[PDB]
């Protein structure tokens, strides 16, 4: 009877785990080994990354259940800060950050789906972009048809991802059960004192990329079932499981492949399937590709919800956030998300666009969690169904400031260009909303376009 509420505690976990686990573990697990060298240092650094994600996620879940509003990481900023910083963050997200991770994940799915066809030579790009576009279009159609199908497919693909990780760790443990260990028992493989200056912090920086979705489920809330109970439970179920899985599969990778040959690799998580099980090895990479597929859906979901909430505040045009009855799905928002994700298919590179704003999420987490302390200082009487040990938000602020400082010091030119891009977006809001009382030469055309689009798509505005 409700408008749209079909997400339980066995679904939300699917969304979070699908968003977290992409190509970070299969494709690029060698950065930490290159930085540190010793397997023990890699294990302890992955454990530290996991606990850092835990302490961030608990605070973010407490903040989300404090202000139970859809569109996380932006609703908190809008309610604390106001109208300008929230619009800046939303505009940069909808322009350069949100519809680029989805495209990169679609590209990696397309690339690792066709790997058995071309085991050695690189997959042609004219056939790798089209598969990503096919995946994006099909997933957008599925999401626009209904939400129940999207939830079911996301849950199935999260289950497949966990099954694949279980299979690889089981094979590794079976090899452990043999008479060969190939582990550094007598002495340390490496000391890892310092590469150039980055003794430890470089491992932390390139050890937090495997995570990142610890904070998405908040982009969906107010559509869950009993959010005050199932949001912190979903986070608590999802996060320690994923960090334990990361640590254990890293141990398997170290104990099944030698350091020297695996360090000099470019397409990791294929030689593992080739060496051990030999014939029919294509079951390892193809399934991995399927993994990435599901993740896109997850991200796609939240993306739509984000643009459903921004236009609620007049930040985005009112044409969006106009649901379609008899299906209760935001058709214009999903179409906009799919089109904007496709729009980046013309970038012939993969390194740019997203690497300028690596510091952006790190600063935004701090900017949205200082709102926690500000709200605690101003209005300490809002309902709080769960409480954790205090003084952790300030520790996370210290960690976030350290992380943005490390990112700036490691690469200042790219961060400076990113800062220029974010700062240059103010004009679009200065002369986009503030310039009210416009004459009747532009508003009537916008209204006409809105009504014809409504007729074309058969949508109605949200009812209360």
């Amino acid at each position: 009877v409700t408008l749209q509420r079909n997400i339980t505690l066995l679904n939300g976990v699917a969304i979070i785990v699908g968003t977290i686990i992409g190509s970070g573990i299969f494709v690029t697990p060698t950065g930490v080994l290159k930085e540190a060298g010793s397997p023990g240092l890699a294990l302890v650094v992955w454990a530290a990354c996991g606990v850092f994600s835990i302490v961030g996620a608990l605070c973010y879940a407490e903040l989300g259940t404090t202000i139970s509003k859809s569109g996380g990481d932006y609703a908190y900023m809008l309610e604390v800060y106001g109208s300008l910083p929230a619009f800046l963050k939303l505009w940069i997200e909808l322009l350069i950050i949100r519809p680029s991770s989805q495209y990169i994940v679609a590209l990696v799915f397309a690339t690792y789906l066709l790997k058995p066809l071309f085991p050695t030579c690189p997959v042609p790009e004219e056939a790798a972009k089209l598969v990503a576009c096919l995946c994006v279009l099909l997933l957008t159609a599925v999401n626009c048809y209904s939400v129940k199908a999207a939830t079911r497919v996301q849950d199935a693909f999260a289950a497949a991802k966990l099954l694949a990780l279980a299979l690889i760790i089981l094979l590794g443990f079976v090899q452990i059960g043999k008479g060969d260990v190939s582990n550094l028992d007598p002495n340390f493989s490496f000391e890892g004192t310092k590469l150039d200056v980055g003794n430890i912090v470089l491992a932390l920086y390139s050890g937090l990329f495997a995570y990142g979705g610890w904070n998405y489920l908040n982009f969906v809330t107010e559509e869950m079932i009993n959010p005050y109970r199932n949001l912190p439970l979903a986070i608590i179920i999802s996060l320690p499981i994923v960090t334990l899985v990361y640590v254990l599969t890293n141990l398997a990778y170290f104990t099944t492949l030698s350091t020297e040959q695996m360090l000099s690799s470019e397409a990791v998580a294929v030689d593992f399937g080739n060496y051990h099980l030999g014939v029919m090895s294509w079951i390892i990479p193809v399934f991995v590709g399927l993994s990435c597929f599901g993740s896109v859906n997850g991200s796609l979901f939240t993306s739509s919800r984000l643009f459903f909430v921004g236009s609620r505040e007049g930040h985005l045009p009112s044409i969006l956030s106009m649901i379609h009855p008899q299906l209760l799905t935001p058709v214009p928002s999903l179409v906009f998300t799919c089109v904007m994700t496709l729009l980046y298919a013309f970038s012939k590179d993969i390194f740019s666009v997203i690497n300028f704003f690596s510091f952006f999420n790190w600063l935004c987490v701090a900017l949205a969690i200082i709102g926690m302390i500000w709200l605690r200082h101003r209005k300490p009487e809002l309902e709080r169904p769960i409480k954790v040990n205090l003084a952790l938000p300030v520790f996370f602020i210290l960690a976030c400031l350290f992380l943005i400082a490390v990112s700036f010091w490691k690469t200042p030119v790219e961060c400076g260009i990113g800062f220029t891009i974010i700062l240059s977006g103010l004009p679009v809001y200065f002369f986009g909303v503030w310039w009210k009382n416009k004459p009747k030469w532009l508003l009537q055309g916008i209204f006409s376009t809105t009504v014809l689009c409504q007729k074309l798509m058969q949508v109605v505005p949200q009812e209360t």
């Binding site: 071309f118 690189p122 056939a127």
Partner: protein
């Protein structure tokens, strides 16, 4: 903007001719998706496939290091095998995937009865120590190759008396050392033992029948191509090292002629590229050509063999009272207790490790580049004509980075004048090529250099790379 009316909008959108419009648009979208899928499938099918993988053995993926006597490599006092356990890390720094450890079996005169290759000499060490060395090398991913030349002290290197006894002793010690754990064998001075072809074929047969990852090396002192080719007739998996390569010291095109002739006669097969069997570069070359040969031997299509002291440019003529065959290794300034100042600071491994213009740095970079790069590992080799004294060739496997090496053996500088006009169009060199290194410092590195304005100072070489071109 404020929310269009719910009911009239629903009721108006029922007129025939416009409800079918959305059906037509949906069908158009689905047929466009199907068309794009079909186009992607067509593009996938019509594309070149990965050629193959040759499934190379262990000795195809790196150099080989020869240690004739451990006494000179280590120093006075620590003449045992366990001392190499303290030095293997250094070798792992050089990135050498082999170690041709010299003969260790007992021998003190031209006798035949009490001189046997069954067990190790007591002075060298112990069997348990040798097994410890084997396990340490295995942990370090280094394969130790043994040597079984029956006689190495006297002039008669292979017991010119009856040869049945020595053949039986070799065939009996072979499987002994196989179950011991060694990964290869070498026999030197193959011209002394009679009817060498049959014995070499038998030894290769037994060694390759024991396992698929075993290696046997032969060493001959003949520079004639016909003799070498006749030796390689009955057996083909042989690795043969001969002094045939050098044959020079004042000629530049001769090296290209010999290399191309050998490759053509042997059928573009696997061969070992070495200057000699138990000698180093400085014996046959002056100090002004070492870098050129170090660059040539680390790019030719085969397994390169170097002797000890061949990366620091060790030379035996620069010191007095030094044996020519096995000079001591200049580890540091404490090479000799006396003459404190005869040696220099650039003749030691410590003084050459960090010097950008040292030989050891070039050796390390070249070995690292050869060990990992696939085109240098098992890529096809193609040579074309060049100027009067230029040796230029291309290494290219399937689709990886192609490598172009050009060396100048002349005594004066000259322009390159690169032109092939005969190579297949698949790997045609472009007009723009990158750069890797230069043997003699005084040039740029890391940035593209045009191939039409190339100039070469005397005694130089270039290791340009270019990517796969459609």
């Amino acid at each position: 903007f404020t929310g269009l009316s719910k009911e009239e909008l629903l009721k108006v959108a029922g007129s025939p001719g416009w409800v079918r419009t959305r059906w037509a648009l949906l069908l158009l979208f689905w047929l466009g998706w199907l068309g794009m899928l079909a186009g992607a499938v067509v593009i996938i099918v019509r594309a070149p496939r990965c050629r193959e993988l040759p499934a190379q053995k262990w000795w195809h993926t790196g150099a080989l290091y020869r240690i004739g006597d451990l006494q000179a490599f280590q120093g006075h006092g620590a003449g045992n095998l366990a001392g190499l356990k303290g030095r293997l890390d250094y070798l792992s720094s050089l990135k050498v995937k082999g170690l041709v450890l010299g003969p260790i079996h007992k021998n003190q005169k031209d006798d035949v009865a009490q001189t046997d290759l069954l067990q190790i000499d007591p002075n060298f060490g112990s069997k348990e120590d040798f097994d410890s060395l084997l396990q340490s090398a295995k942990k370090k991913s280094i394969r130790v190759i043994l040597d079984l030349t029956p006689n190495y002290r006297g002039e008669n290197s292979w017991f010119s008396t009856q040869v049945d006894t020595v053949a039986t002793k070799v065939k009996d010690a072979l499987e002994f050392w196989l179950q011991a754990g060694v990964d290869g064998f070498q026999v030197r001075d193959i011209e002394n033992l009679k009817d060498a072809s049959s014995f070499l074929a038998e030894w290769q047969n037994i060694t390759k029948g024991f396992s698929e990852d075993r290696l046997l090396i032969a060493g001959t002192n003949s520079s004639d191509l016909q003799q070498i080719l006749s030796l390689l007739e009955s057996n083909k998996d042989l690795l043969l090292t001969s002094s045939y390569l050098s044959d020079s010291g004042s000629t530049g095109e001769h090296t290209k002629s010999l290399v191309t002739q050998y490759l053509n006669a042997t059928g573009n097969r696997w061969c070992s590229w070495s200057l000699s069997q138990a000698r180093l570069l400085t014996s046959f070359l002056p100090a002004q050509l070492l870098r050129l040969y170090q660059l040539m031997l680390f790019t030719l299509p085969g397994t390169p063999v170097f002797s000890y002291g061949d990366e620091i440019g060790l030379d035996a003529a620069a010191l007095p009272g030094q044996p020519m065959e096995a000079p001591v290794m200049l580890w540091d300034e404490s090479s000799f207790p006396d003459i404190p100042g005869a040696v220099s600071a650039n003749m030691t491994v410590k003084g050459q490790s960090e010097d950008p213009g040292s030989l050891l740095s070039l050796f390390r970079r070249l070995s690292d580049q050869r060990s990992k790069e696939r085109s240098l590992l098992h890529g096809d080799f193609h040579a074309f004509s060049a100027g009067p004294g230029l040796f230029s060739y291309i290494r290219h496997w399937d689709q990886n980075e192609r490598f172009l090496v050009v060396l100048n053996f002349g005594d004066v500088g000259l322009s390159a004048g690169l032109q092939a006009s005969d190579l297949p169009a698949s790997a045609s060199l472009p007009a723009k090529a990158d750069l890797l290194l230069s043997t003699q410092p005084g040039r740029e590195e890391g940035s593209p250099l045009e191939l039409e304005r190339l100039k070469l100072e005397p005694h130089e070489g270039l290791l340009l790379r270019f990517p796969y071109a459609a």
